[PDB]
Amino acid sequence: SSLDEIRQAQRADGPAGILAIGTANPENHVLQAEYPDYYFRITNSEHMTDLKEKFKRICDKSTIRKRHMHLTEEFLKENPHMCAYMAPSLDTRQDIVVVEVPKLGKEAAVKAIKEWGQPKSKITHVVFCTTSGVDMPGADYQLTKLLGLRPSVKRLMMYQQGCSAGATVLRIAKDLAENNRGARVLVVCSEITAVTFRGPSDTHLDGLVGAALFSDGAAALIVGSDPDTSVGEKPIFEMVSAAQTILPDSDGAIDGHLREVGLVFHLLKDVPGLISKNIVKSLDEAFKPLGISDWNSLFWIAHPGGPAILDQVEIKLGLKEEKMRATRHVLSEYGNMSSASVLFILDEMRRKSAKDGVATTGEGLEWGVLFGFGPGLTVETVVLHSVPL
Amino acid sequence: SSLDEIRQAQRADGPAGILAIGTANPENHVLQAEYPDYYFRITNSEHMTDLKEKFKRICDKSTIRKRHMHLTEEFLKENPHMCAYMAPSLDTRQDIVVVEVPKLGKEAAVKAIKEWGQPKSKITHVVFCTTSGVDMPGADYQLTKLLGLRPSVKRLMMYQQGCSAGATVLRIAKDLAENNRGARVLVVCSEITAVTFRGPSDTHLDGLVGAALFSDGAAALIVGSDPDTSVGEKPIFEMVSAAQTILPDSDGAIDGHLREVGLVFHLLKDVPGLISKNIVKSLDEAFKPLGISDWNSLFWIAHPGGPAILDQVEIKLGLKEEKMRATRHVLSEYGNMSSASVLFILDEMRRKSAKDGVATTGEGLEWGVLFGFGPGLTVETVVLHSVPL
């Protein structure tokens, strides 16, 4: 009868758990060892001899082996304005990503839903996250239609979000699942680099970094509180807290502008240094209340923005080299898939933990941390607990 | 602590309440009676006699008196590519709205925070919503910086959201506030029509509607559970439930595409007809659990997408004339400010209720409903409870 009573019945009881993880990538991929030759050829830039050598050095430093890319050589040959450095091309880019982002997201979601093993009609919420394109209705609507979810799913459409947003969607899903009894949240991060792909220029050296690191992929989760063991629900990880902060003295470190030439990034400031200098304050805030101060006692997931961030955090905290292993494995095999990346690493970690026969989904450890890094500079910190294997 | 104990300690107890409302608009405004002449003059289109007459009649029926617009005659005189029908212009539009959307949002936020009466350091969360431009970092970051909020605010950046999203941010804020003990959510919707303004054409009759109805404004809320009366917190409305659904047979009713020419809308189907046909299903879903079936017993807030929606809903449900008064007032005095509109209407309702000395913030009634309408076609339904005056 009362509002109070309504509220306690309406809400869930326990912590939000990740009940399933599915991933997908375009089948087309490039080996990083071959990418400088390919990139400078298809962008008609082979006369830029010195700049190509610079790009080879950057690609060698990236530690990336393979990247999946929706964009094919055959398609780019028909669309020279996308191969140019700065030609009007946003319409063409939008035409691609407003279709392909939800399509790739659907591939990941189907896999997640199958693992979960419950009826798709049981999904109550959809969180869709991308940095690739915008449209009305959004990608969330298209995913709903493609999957044939109930028309009354509660949707949140997270557009132009950037690299921190794998952590962001965990934070979003956590509150949705925990505040709503029975709620089952389909989370999808889907990224396609057709918005940023362009020809190189010595007037845009930042562009060379993106051209070496960014890649395509999608990851899907089912998130829910109060798992029902009797129908086979089992969490993989449980979320305990999720936080977000802007780093001091970082104003203007990473800007991304959506223009008539597509999405353009601009880098200033020492991003790996800023993150490494500050990350302990986030660890303290997250773990002091839990009585934990040994960062090597944690299982780790960090957004693989590039190798320097990871190397410098490792050095700064004295992490054992094992800690960043799952993060680096994804960077190596997939590149920087923006928001999706930390969700691929979760998948890698729980899969390897099973193969290696250790005691929990978190490399045999109890507590863990997941970091998202993005414009702001923003650092998102999610505290996770493993589950026994 | 166990995870379940941590969870209990981490969350709030009661329903989320709207603790404060503030609004703002660009100073510059246009009277609707004068707009057909002005619009067709400034876009060098006054020789399009038959088209201008079509536009005049649309404005004559719009029931709008006044619309605020950041775009001035002088600015448009200096930027004629904005006045052309479909000229390259996204970059110019972005340059405007990436600044003006958060600035206008800040103005509304300062008013809400003053009414709330608490230190801004107590804001824990920020939800920013717009349909006007995109950027990285987002308007949420810019607002955080402009207001000097704590760097550790938890942010959600809702971009390209559209007309249903005043309801959306209520749905978001409800879960944020209810699931986090002590959380105080700053919600801002800020809309600036510089992204859609363009010259008229008989090849884009759909655009005449937007040109007649869309307007600029921002609204801010403070939302929180567990109000502290000892420091002067008092909810204005309390949220009970928030739902969302896609109407049947409505595919493509409203599409909006962000292109090199800016934002462009395309309309199909009978949107007033679709909503009137389907709205009782949403009312039933929301109120049948509450034992409420008399739609004239509710206080009403409906997104004023245009007058035909409101007229056809009124006729379908047999609503008394008075029910849509607050909605129609905002439409008349401000036009369709997209996502901000319903939040202005909440403000108008609670202010008129106090002026008239009625029993509650919701026109003296206990229960109320707030609808958002947008692309999908999406209908959002928020159940509200008033507070005694």
Side-chain angles (χ1 to χ4, degrees):
Chain A
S1 308
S2 78
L3 294 199
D4 175 39
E5 282 176 314
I6 291 167
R7 181 85 274 280
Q8 311 320 319
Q10 189 181 73
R11 75 197 310 154
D13 292 328
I18 302 177
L19 293 169
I21 305 166
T23 68
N25 310 84
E27 292 186 34
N28 186 61
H29 63 280
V30 295
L31 297 183
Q32 192 72 324
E34 304 171 343
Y35 199 70
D37 288 337
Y38 170 71
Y39 178 54
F40 274 72
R41 173 172 59 82
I42 195 62
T43 61
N44 300 329
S45 292
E46 266 165 334
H47 63 283
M48 298 182 192
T49 303
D50 294 331
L51 194 69
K52 185 186 178 170
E53 291 304 306
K54 188 181 197 72
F55 186 64
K56 285 180 190 300
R57 290 190 290 275
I58 289 168
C59 285
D60 291 336
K61 282 191 66 172
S62 72
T63 73
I64 294 170
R65 188 186 74 80
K66 155 166 80 58
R67 290 187 282 161
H68 299 255
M69 293 183 185
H70 179 76
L71 291 178
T72 64
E73 171 170 353
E74 289 208 340
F75 176 93
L76 288 169
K77 176 179 168 185
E78 296 312 321
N79 293 267
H81 62 309
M82 270 177 79
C83 298
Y85 162 51
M86 298 279 267
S89 51
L90 171 73
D91 291 352
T92 302
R93 297 168 190 278
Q94 288 273 71
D95 290 346
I96 296 156
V97 300
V98 297
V99 175
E100 298 298 333
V101 163
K103 178 172 188 303
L104 190 66
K106 180 214 170 174
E107 295 183 40
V110 168
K111 293 181 204 192
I113 289 161
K114 185 189 179 190
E115 176 185 1
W116 181 42
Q118 312 307 310
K120 60 182 164 63
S121 69
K122 199 168 165 272
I123 291 162
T124 51
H125 297 67
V126 177
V127 178
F128 202 113
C129 171
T130 190
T131 318
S132 321
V134 310
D135 200 33
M136 308 168 87
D140 61 316
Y141 168 85
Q142 307 293 352
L143 179 71
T144 295
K145 291 292 181 184
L146 289 172
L147 290 171
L149 300 182
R150 288 186 296 104
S152 296
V153 287
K154 292 159 182 73
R155 292 170 284 122
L156 293 173
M157 177 69 248
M158 312 305 300
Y159 268 133
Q160 208 69 26
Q161 294 284 310
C163 285
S164 67
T168 307
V169 295
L170 287 172
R171 174 162 54 88
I172 293 167
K174 177 187 185 296
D175 285 338
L176 300 187
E178 289 169 0
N179 201 48
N180 295 282
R181 192 176 299 278
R184 293 288 180 266
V185 187
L186 175 63
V187 179
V188 174
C189 292
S190 181
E191 301 286 11
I192 290 180
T193 55
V195 278
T196 50
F197 179 85
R198 66 185 70 263
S201 176
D202 53 22
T203 69
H204 191 39
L205 300 179
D206 298 347
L208 292 177
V209 174
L213 300 182
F214 284 138
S215 65
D216 301 2
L221 318 172
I222 298 293
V223 177
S225 290
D226 311 330
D228 185 350
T229 304
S230 76
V231 297
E233 293 189 315
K234 44 167 169 184
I236 304 161
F237 297 102
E238 303 187 290
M239 287 186 271
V240 177
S241 68
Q244 182 188 49
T245 202
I246 298 162
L247 296 192
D249 299 312
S250 74
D251 184 53
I254 305 166
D255 291 346
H257 307 310
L258 188 67
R259 308 296 279 181
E260 297 163 28
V261 298
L263 178 57
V264 181
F265 286 98
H266 301 287
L267 315 176
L268 316 165
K269 309 212 167 162
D270 166 20
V271 168
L274 283 168
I275 292 163
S276 50
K277 170 171 179 182
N278 285 286
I279 194 168
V280 174
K281 187 180 188 170
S282 283
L283 288 160
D284 278 347
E285 178 169 336
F287 284 104
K288 203 149 169 50
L290 296 176
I292 297 167
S293 64
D294 175 10
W295 318 131
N296 276 308
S297 77
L298 300 174
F299 62 90
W300 274 75
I301 301 92
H303 174 67
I309 292 168
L310 308 177
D311 294 347
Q312 288 183 43
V313 165
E314 170 176 84
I315 283 171
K316 174 69 162 193
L317 301 182
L319 299 182
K320 299 169 191 303
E321 102 168 285
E322 292 61 48
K323 305 319 283 199
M324 286 290 183
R325 190 182 279 135
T327 293
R328 290 171 167 142
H329 178 76
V330 168
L331 176 62
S332 287
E333 287 305 294
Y334 299 102
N336 174 357
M337 297 167 290
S338 185
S339 67
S341 306
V342 290
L343 302 187
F344 276 73
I345 297 162
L346 287 179
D347 198 25
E348 165 67 16
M349 182 180 287
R350 61 92 174 233
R351 288 187 180 266
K352 183 166 196 290
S353 295
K355 279 204 194 58
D356 293 347
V358 295
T360 77
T361 53
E363 315 189 330
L365 307 175
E366 294 298 299
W367 295 96
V369 69
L370 179 152
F371 287 104
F373 307 129
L377 221 49
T378 300
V379 177
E380 297 222 21
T381 308
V382 182
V383 174
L384 305 167
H385 201 290
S386 65
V387 177
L389 288 176
Chain B
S1 292
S2 69
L3 296 190
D4 284 346
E5 288 179 305
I6 293 168
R7 188 75 276 278
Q8 283 199 343
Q10 193 183 79
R11 66 194 186 202
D13 300 318
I18 300 174
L19 297 166
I21 310 166
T23 67
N25 309 84
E27 275 212 341
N28 182 62
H29 61 272
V30 295
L31 300 185
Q32 186 77 325
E34 293 158 30
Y35 200 69
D37 286 345
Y38 169 67
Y39 176 47
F40 273 73
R41 175 169 64 77
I42 193 64
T43 65
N44 197 26
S45 296
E46 80 291 339
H47 62 289
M48 302 183 184
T49 300
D50 288 342
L51 190 67
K52 178 170 174 190
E53 181 60 24
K54 275 201 191 292
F55 184 68
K56 168 94 158 54
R57 283 189 291 243
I58 290 172
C59 295
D60 286 342
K61 293 173 52 170
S62 68
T63 79
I64 297 172
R65 186 182 73 82
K66 165 166 71 63
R67 286 191 286 156
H68 295 252
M69 292 184 180
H70 175 78
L71 287 175
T72 65
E73 179 169 351
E74 184 183 71
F75 178 85
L76 290 170
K77 172 271 195 195
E78 290 176 357
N79 296 267
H81 60 304
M82 298 278 295
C83 292
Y85 164 50
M86 292 284 194
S89 60
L90 179 62
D91 290 358
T92 297
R93 298 171 191 273
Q94 289 274 68
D95 289 348
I96 298 160
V97 296
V98 300
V99 170
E100 298 303 328
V101 162
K103 176 177 185 300
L104 185 68
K106 183 210 181 207
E107 291 179 30
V110 164
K111 293 176 197 180
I113 291 164
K114 184 177 183 179
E115 172 187 4
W116 181 38
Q118 315 305 319
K120 62 189 165 90
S121 60
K122 300 280 190 182
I123 293 160
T124 51
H125 294 71
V126 173
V127 180
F128 203 106
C129 174
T130 187
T131 316
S132 314
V134 305
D135 203 33
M136 313 174 77
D140 63 314
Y141 169 83
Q142 304 295 354
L143 180 70
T144 295
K145 179 177 176 182
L146 289 168
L147 286 175
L149 302 187
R150 278 194 289 90
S152 62
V153 285
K154 291 165 185 73
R155 295 171 282 123
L156 297 171
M157 179 67 246
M158 313 303 298
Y159 270 128
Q160 213 62 43
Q161 291 291 298
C163 286
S164 74
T168 307
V169 296
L170 293 169
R171 171 159 57 86
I172 294 167
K174 175 186 191 299
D175 289 336
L176 297 188
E178 288 171 357
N179 201 51
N180 293 283
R181 191 179 298 279
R184 290 291 175 269
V185 185
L186 178 66
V187 179
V188 175
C189 296
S190 182
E191 301 285 12
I192 291 186
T193 56
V195 287
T196 48
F197 179 89
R198 71 187 69 260
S201 182
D202 63 12
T203 65
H204 195 219
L205 300 185
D206 296 344
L208 294 183
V209 172
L213 302 186
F214 283 143
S215 63
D216 296 3
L221 323 170
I222 293 296
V223 175
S225 291
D226 308 334
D228 181 355
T229 62
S230 77
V231 300
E233 288 190 315
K234 184 179 182 245
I236 307 165
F237 298 103
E238 292 184 294
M239 281 182 286
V240 180
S241 64
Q244 185 189 43
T245 201
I246 298 159
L247 301 188
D249 303 318
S250 74
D251 209 313
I254 304 170
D255 300 338
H257 311 307
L258 191 59
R259 312 292 283 176
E260 293 166 35
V261 297
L263 178 57
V264 186
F265 282 100
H266 304 284
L267 311 179
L268 298 172
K269 296 186 173 187
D270 183 349
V271 164
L274 277 167
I275 293 173
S276 299
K277 174 180 191 172
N278 287 281
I279 194 165
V280 171
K281 183 161 190 153
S282 284
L283 287 163
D284 275 353
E285 177 171 332
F287 286 102
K288 196 147 168 46
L290 290 170
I292 297 171
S293 62
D294 182 355
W295 312 137
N296 276 306
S297 74
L298 308 170
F299 58 93
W300 272 77
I301 300 90
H303 174 67
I309 290 166
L310 309 177
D311 290 346
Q312 282 178 229
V313 169
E314 184 171 86
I315 285 155
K316 182 75 176 202
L317 307 183
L319 298 180
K320 295 169 200 302
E321 247 105 25
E322 321 96 59
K323 307 313 301 199
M324 288 285 185
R325 191 216 63 84
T327 295
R328 272 159 176 161
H329 176 82
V330 166
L331 178 57
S332 183
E333 293 295 308
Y334 297 100
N336 174 0
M337 297 168 291
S338 186
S339 67
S341 305
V342 291
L343 300 190
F344 276 71
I345 293 165
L346 286 176
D347 197 25
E348 162 66 21
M349 178 175 298
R350 60 93 175 230
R351 288 178 174 273
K352 187 81 184 310
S353 295
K355 174 163 86 176
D356 287 351
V358 292
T360 78
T361 51
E363 309 186 332
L365 308 180
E366 296 297 309
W367 297 95
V369 65
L370 182 151
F371 289 103
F373 311 128
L377 210 57
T378 299
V379 173
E380 290 219 28
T381 311
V382 179
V383 173
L384 299 171
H385 199 117
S386 63
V387 174
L389 290 171

